[PDB]
Amino acid sequence: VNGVMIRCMLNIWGVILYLRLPWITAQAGIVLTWIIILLSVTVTSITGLSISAISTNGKVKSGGTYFLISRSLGPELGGSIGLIFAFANAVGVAMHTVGFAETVRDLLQEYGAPIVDPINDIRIIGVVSVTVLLAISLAGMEWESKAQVLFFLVIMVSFANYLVGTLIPPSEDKASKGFFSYRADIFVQNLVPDWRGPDGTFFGMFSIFFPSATGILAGANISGDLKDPAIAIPKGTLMAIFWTTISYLAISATIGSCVVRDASGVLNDTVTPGWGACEGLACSYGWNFTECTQQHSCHYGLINYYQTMSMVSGFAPLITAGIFGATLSSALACLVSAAKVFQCLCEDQLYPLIGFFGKGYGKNKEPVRGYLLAYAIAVAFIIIAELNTIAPIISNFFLCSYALINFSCFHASITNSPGWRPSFQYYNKWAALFGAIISVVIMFLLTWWAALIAIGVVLFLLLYVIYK
Amino acid sequence: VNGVMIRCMLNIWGVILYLRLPWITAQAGIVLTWIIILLSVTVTSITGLSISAISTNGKVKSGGTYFLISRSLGPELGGSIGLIFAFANAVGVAMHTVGFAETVRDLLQEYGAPIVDPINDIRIIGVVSVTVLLAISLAGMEWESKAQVLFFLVIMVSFANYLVGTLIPPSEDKASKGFFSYRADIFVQNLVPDWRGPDGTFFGMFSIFFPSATGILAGANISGDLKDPAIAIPKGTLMAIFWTTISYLAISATIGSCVVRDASGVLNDTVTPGWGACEGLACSYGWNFTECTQQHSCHYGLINYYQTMSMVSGFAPLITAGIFGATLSSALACLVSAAKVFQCLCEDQLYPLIGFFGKGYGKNKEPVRGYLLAYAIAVAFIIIAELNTIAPIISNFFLCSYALINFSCFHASITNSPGWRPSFQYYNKWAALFGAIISVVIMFLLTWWAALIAIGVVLFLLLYVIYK
Ligand SMILES: [Cl-]
Ligand SMILES: [Cl-]
Ligand code: NA
Ligand code: NA
């Protein structure tokens, strides 16, 4: 609980929940958003059942996630799955850091002190933030162990503030920005999808959303340090998945039934007595959102404003603190996981080239080189400075890693390996096979060339080892 | 020569050479057509080197192509490669039959006696033609052995007639339909691509053209009946590939340097002095092709008329006879190959289900059931009655078969199997690996979902057997 459930819930809850989920709901309608969430949760639930079977298998040693997977499924697939997982965690660090940078940039713009321009402002904020994160990670772990509860408390306060703000009747300033109390007609209108933009498709938004359902391996990271990991890991992981899914569904429905898609934000844009016009719901409450809809120059609303969740709630700085806590926790966990995976992969000497990056230093032999490699990849991907572009890469790589773990578990089951005998009672071979197949199909549906690159990397890694 | 080179040359030369190659040239320009031809010939030449290495391996027995491949590379991949090859040959039978049906429909329309409507006319003509082909194939082989030389002579006469017609200065009726003598400006204009229609893309037209470079396995079909197959098969196959490539290149350049893209066909459409608005290279010879160019209703020309190779030549019925000979030879060879592959695959009892279709009948134990299955698939695909729609499926399936044979040969080379030791001196492992990789990449560039289906079928077949 204190080392399995809470860590998984903190790693899963990240940047997408606070900045892109209302936008995804507005773009894709509540029903299709629910379908996206349910499909992603089925994929992650099959993966979680496979992970629980792996963790329950045999005797758990103090080796970590990569060591557990390697000793459960053999090094031939363990090396490739570890490398892909590490790359996915590094690009996830980049995504969480750029989300934090966007939040800080918006806060600075609210102060009214821009530096040069929004994109480069994001760039400097992200690089400074990731450098500070590297310094903190190299400092020690007691601070983050103490700050885990702080992050949890802050995010819970953020959730409570959001719910209270939804329950409060709308104010004039919030009404001008497209926020009204719970309404049946708003829910009816938001039931149907309304696509916009270049990435306004079902599978594009699935690719954007999917990183918000990842992070289920975190509970396994400290499998060796748990007193009773064999019972704690599966129940904790599954409960974390269930509660995060419930939170996603509730937030999606509540935000979709409360605010309209298009808003102007102009305070003097009320529906004056005498001549005036009706646009959608607005006219029913004394607002005229016509010209903003026609010229497509709406700076606010659920479909245009990414920070509408902060506007809806009662006291915005609590939401900002929740965003900071979620992003920092997710980014730090991803960085630690990537560094540990890189170090442990280089320890086993899978390839002669990777060995030169496996010589740790420091008093406690901390793997400085792995942290520096992860930092370099994180900066290289932060240079992009676009959340909607970094998200699909992580979606693709996490889908590939889940496909490999599911298919490897299926192959071990069907082949009847001598040393592989799980004791989990909810594991089935055909469920894992279906999960692997559907994950590969979704991977190719999202982006075919990225899927080809990932499969080519998998085949290269395997074939190289199987041959040599 | 008489059993390797000529058979390969007759099987390669088919419907695409006579009906779609001028259209492909008009769509994609001479330079890109040459690039398409060279890329396709590179793939087929790597596959031909692999085939030559397989044929040279060990001692050749009277078993045919499937038996040779299975005894050279093992049954695990042999079964899957045979099944995919048989399916590709069946759909190729469908393609050649529908091309023959289109030719007969055009002849009937020229006679002025349509039956019901062009598409269903194609349907009945194709069904009757494939039934007659089945009856002829079940009759005996002496007739086709005697008619091979007739088909060769007819197609050579067709080529000579085409060249002579190109050399003859244009006539008034041919000029009105868009045919002029060799011209530098026409060549210059046709050097640049001009895309049109829904499939007017580089890779779509590659998919359409690719079946015209296939049929290189035919020379191996009678490997057991050759006195000296080990020397005859590689040289014959490579010479056939070279000469077919030269013919394709020469025909493409000659047709692209001789006829303009757009033509009207109206005989009274000359450029009367002082009248008619003028555009295009037809106004240099006293023609006014502007009106149909603006309305996009040009019924003739290289860009619209599929039967322009017949009008270009001197005496059209010779071209029609050549079309009949090429299509009949290709279709009959594909049907025989598909039936033989189906029968030999069912003989080995790879799967329990396929055995029920492996019980041959007749006095000589001819595989009637395999012929009926191939006939059923051929009719099911003829029902489509569209050459440009049947072609990509065949492209994908030969691409899959070639990728599998190349990769299997590479794997046998690198793994150093005990019984696999070719003696061909032009074979290299990395060439085969490059061929397999480029074939898979081209497959996914053509159609990603068809590629996924083919790879899933391969994995299902390979995995089923590897597990059981
Ligand atoms: Cl994860
Ligand atoms: Cl072939
Ligand atoms: Na978090
Ligand atoms: Na032919």
Curated annotation (Swiss-Prot), chains A, B:
The entry's localization annotation reads:
Cell membrane; Apical cell membrane
Q: Which residues lie on this side of the membrane: Cytoplasmic?
A: 52-82, 223-233, 340-369, 407-429
Residues engaged in binding Na(+): 10, 13, 326, 329-330
Q: Mutating residue 301 to S has which effect?
A: In GTLMNS; does not affect MAPK1/3 (ERK1/2) phosphorylation in response to IL18
The listed outcome for residue 20 to A is: Strongly reduced sodium and chloride ion cotransporter activity
Looking at the UniProt entry, the stretches that span the membrane are 1-29, 30-51, 83-105, 118-142, 143-165, 201-222, 234-255, 316-339, 370-384, 390-406, 430-449, 450-461
Q: In which tissues is it expressed?
A: Predominantly expressed in the kidney (at protein level). Localizes to the distal convoluted tubules (at protein level). Not detected in normal aorta, but abundantly expressed in fatty streaks and advanced atherosclerotic lesions (at protein level).
Q: Which domain of life is it from?
A: Eukaryota
Tell me what the record says results from residue 85 to A. Answer: Reduced sensitivity to thiazide diuretics
Ranges per topology, Extracellular: 106-117, 166-200, 256-315, 385-389
User: What does the entry report about post-translational modification of this chain?
Assistant: Ubiquitinated; ubiquitination is essential for regulation of endocytosis. The BCR(KLHL3) complex was initially identified as a candidate ubiquitin ligase for SLC12A3. However, it was later shown that it is not the case.
Explain what the record says happens when changing residue 20 to Q: In GTLMNS; impaired protein structure
Effect of changing residue 337 to C: reported as: In GTLMNS; 40% residual Na(+) uptake activity; increased MAPK1/3 (ERK1/2) phosphorylation in response to IL18; no effect on localization at the plasma membrane
Per the UniProt entry, the effect of residue 102 to A is: Strongly reduced sodium and chloride ion cotransporter activity
Query: At which positions is chloride bound?
Result: 215-217, 402
Family designation: Belongs to the SLC12A transporter family.
- Its quaternary structure? Homodimer; adopts a domain-swap conformation at the scissor helices connecting the transmembrane domain and C-terminal domain. Interacts with KLHL3. Interacts with IL18R1; this interaction is increased by IL18 treatment.
Associated disease: Gitelman syndrome: An autosomal recessive disorder characterized by hypokalemic alkalosis in combination with hypomagnesemia, low urinary calcium, and increased renin activity associated with normal blood pressure. Patients are often asymptomatic or present transient periods of muscular weakness and tetany, usually accompanied by abdominal pain, vomiting and fever. The phenotype is highly heterogeneous in terms of age at onset and severity. Cardinal features such as hypocalciuria and hypomagnesemia might also change during the life cycle of a given patient.
Q: What is this protein called?
A: Solute carrier family 12 member 3
- Record the organism: Homo sapiens (Human)
Q: Species lineage, top-down?
A: Eukaryota, Metazoa, Chordata, Craniata, Vertebrata
| Portion of the full-length sequence here | 139 to 606 of 1021
